[PDB]
Amino acid sequence: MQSVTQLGSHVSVSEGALVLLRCNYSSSVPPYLFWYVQYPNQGLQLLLKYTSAATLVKGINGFEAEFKKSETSFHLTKPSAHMSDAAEYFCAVSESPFGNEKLTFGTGTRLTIIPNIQNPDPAVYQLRDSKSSDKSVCLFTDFDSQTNVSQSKDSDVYITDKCVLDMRSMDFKSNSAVAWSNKSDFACANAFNNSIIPEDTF
C-alpha cells in the first residue's frame, strides 16, 4: 500500500477491441490491489480485488487483471470492448487484505469506446421548434467515427463535440454534433466545415 500509478489517463478503443488499463504499484509491505469504475453519472464501484488468493483475478462486467509481482503491476483487461464500458477506472492499493484500511488511489484512466458505424449516411439538418425565439440549431449526424468536429472560428458561433446515441431496440447506433447561433447571417449549410465528407446530404 505505499503508492500507485496508472500510465495513460485516456484510452480510446474501437467497440469490440481489446481493453487494457495500466496499473503499477510500489509497496514496502504485502500489497492488496483493487479496481474501481465510475460510470458517467453514478458513483465508484468495485470491479475486482486481489487478495493473495490466486494470480488471475476475474471481476465484474467481463474484466480481468493479472497480479504480476515481478513487474509490480495489476493491469485491467477485457477482450472485447462494449459501449457500456465507457467510464473512468481507478486502481488502488491497501495494506489490508480486504481494503478496510486506507486505500491509495492512482490518477484514473478515462475509457472511451468508438462505435462501429455500420452504414453511414452523413448529413446536416435544420431543426427549429416553432416556439421560435433566438432559435436555429443545426444537427450534423449519422457520420462515421473517422469524422471529428472542429471547434468554432467565429467566437460568437457554438459547435458541440460529437456524441454517440444508441437506439438499443433497433441495434442501431449513430453520431451527432449540434451547432447554433442567434446571428441572422448564419446557415446550417455553412456552419460545420472541418474534416467533412463530400457525400454530406442536405
Partner: protein, 241 residues
C-alpha cells in the same frame, strides 16, 4: 448499508469557511474524505479510525476535520479558494468486516470570487428536421440548456411520463458561452432519437428536463431576478402529423 453525504452539490464564495457532512449506518470505525480532480484521481485529505480520532491524508493542507460521533465525519475548508473547487467523496469501512469501502455518492463544490454570477439554465427543445425524417425514417429532437453558471446541471429525457435512456446522447462537457470571461457562463446540448412514426403520433409526449443546483435558500441576495436555487427546468413537445 449506505453512506450518505449531506448535499450533492454546493456553491460558495472565495474566503468562506465550508462544512460538508458524511454519515453512515453500518456502525463503521473508519471514515475517509477524498477529493477527485481530473488527471489526479482520488486524493485522501483526512481519515479517522474511531470516534474522536483523526489523521492527515496525503493532502490535508487547507482542510480540517471533525469526528464527533461514530456515525459522522465532517470536512471543513478553512477559507475557500478555487483550488478547493472539486468533487468530495466520503467513504467508510469496518475494521473487522471483510467488505472494504462503501462510498458515498459525492458532493461537487465550486468556489467563485462573486456570488452574483450564478444563473439557472433556460431550456429549449428543437423538433426534428423534416428532411431527416424522410431520408432515414427516424426523428432527432434536440435540447439546449443555456445561461448556466456554475456548471451544475443534470439533463434527462421523459417520454409519456417514463424516463428513457435508449436513444439519448448528452454532451459530456458543456462549452463556454463566452470563452474569454474567467467565470464565463455555460451551455449544454442533448439529443433524443426515435423512429419517425413515434414522432408522428401526437399520443406520444416528450419532455426535456434539466435539474440545476445553485444557491440554497440560506444564501443571501437581492438582484431583481429569481433566486437561482436548485430547480428543474423542463421544456416539451408533442407528436406531430
Amino acid at each position: 448499508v449506505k453512506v450518505t453525504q449531506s448535499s450533492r452539490y454546493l456553491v460558495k464564495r472565495t474566503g468562506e469557511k465550508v462544512f460538508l457532512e458524511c454519515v453512515q449506518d453500518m456502525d463503521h470505525e473508519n471514515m475517509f474524505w477524498y477529493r477527485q480532480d481530473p488527471g489526479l484521481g482520488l486524493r485522501l485529505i483526512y481519515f479517522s479510525y474511531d470516534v474522536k480520532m483523526k489523521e492527515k491524508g496525503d493532502i490535508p493542507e487547507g482542510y480540517s476535520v471533525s469526528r464527533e460521533k461514530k456515525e459522522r465525519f465532517s470536512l471543513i475548508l478553512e477559507s475557500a479558494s478555487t483550488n478547493q473547487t472539486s468533487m468530495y467523496l466520503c467513504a467508510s469501512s469496518s475494521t473487522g468486516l471483510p467488505y472494504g469501502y462503501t462510498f458515498g455518492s459525492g458532493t461537487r463544490l465550486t468556489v467563485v470570487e462573486d456570488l452574483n454570477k450564478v444563473f439557472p439554465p433556460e431550456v429549449a427543445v428543437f423538433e426534428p428536421s423534416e428532411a431527416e425524417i424522410s431520408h432515414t425514417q427516424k426523428a432527432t429532437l434536440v435540447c439546449l440548456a443555456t445561461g448556466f453558471f456554475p456548471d451544475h446541471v443534470e439533463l434527462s429525457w421523459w417520454v409519456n411520463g417514463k424516463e428513457v435512456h435508449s436513444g439519448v446522447c448528452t454532451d459530456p462537457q458543456p462549452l463556454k458561452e463566452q470563452p474569454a470571461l474567467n467565470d464565463s457562463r455555460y451551455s449544454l446540448s442533448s439529443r433524443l432519437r426515435v423512429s419517425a412514426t413515434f414522432w408522428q403520433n401526437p399520443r406520444n409526449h416528450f419532455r426535456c428536463q434539466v435539474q440545476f443546483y445553485g444557491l440554497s435558500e440560506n444564501d443571501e441576495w437581492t438582484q431583481d431576478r429569481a433566486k437561482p436555487v436548485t430547480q428543474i427546468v423542463s421544456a416539451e413537445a408533442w407528436g406531430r402529423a
